[PDB]
Design a protein around this ligand. Sequence first.
Ligand SMILES: CCc1cccc(CCN(CC2CCNCC2)S(=O)(=O)CCCCn2nc(C)c3c(C)n(-c4ccc(C)cc4)nc3c2=O)c1
Length: 143
Amino acid sequence: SAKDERAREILRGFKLNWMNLRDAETGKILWQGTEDLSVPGVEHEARVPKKILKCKAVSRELNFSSTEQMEKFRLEQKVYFKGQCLEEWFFEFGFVIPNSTNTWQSLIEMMPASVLTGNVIIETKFFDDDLLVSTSRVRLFYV
Ligand SMILES: CCc1cccc(CCN(CC2CCNCC2)S(=O)(=O)CCCCn2nc(C)c3c(C)n(-c4ccc(C)cc4)nc3c2=O)c1
């Protein structure tokens, strides 16, 4: 289909270059990744320090690249706990310039670590407006 071929167009030329998870009161970096975790069809792993759980909020800064233009680049993220959706996050970047490289900052604002580690999956849905480009998943260990 036209929408299904466009969604593959954007996906082929997309890249998550790096991602930072900082403490939002100190800017202190708690976890850095350079893998492309937007890559679907794979269960990625993320071993973040458990101190992230004590933080009031967390600043998530990522840098991505897109060959294809995107009118309204947004994210639908679901936090699964033991296979059921615990929370639903929504973030919107907006217009993406074709062949552009963009850094995007967002702010994520409980249960003990021993319970969450290995039992938290983050499903991130990649949208351009109403078109879904891809779906990736990351498993979280709180070391
Ligand atoms: C509701 C109860 C509960 C239960 C379990 C867990 C939580 C929240 C956990 N915590 C946030 C809290 C911590 C304590 N109070 C402050 C906020 S957390 O541990 O800090 C998470 C920090 C990491 C979140 N995260 N991680 C990755 C790896 C991501 C990737 C790859 N993409 C990604 C984005 C775009 C694309 C195209 C592709 C991919 N988006 C990611 C992302 O959002 C809550």
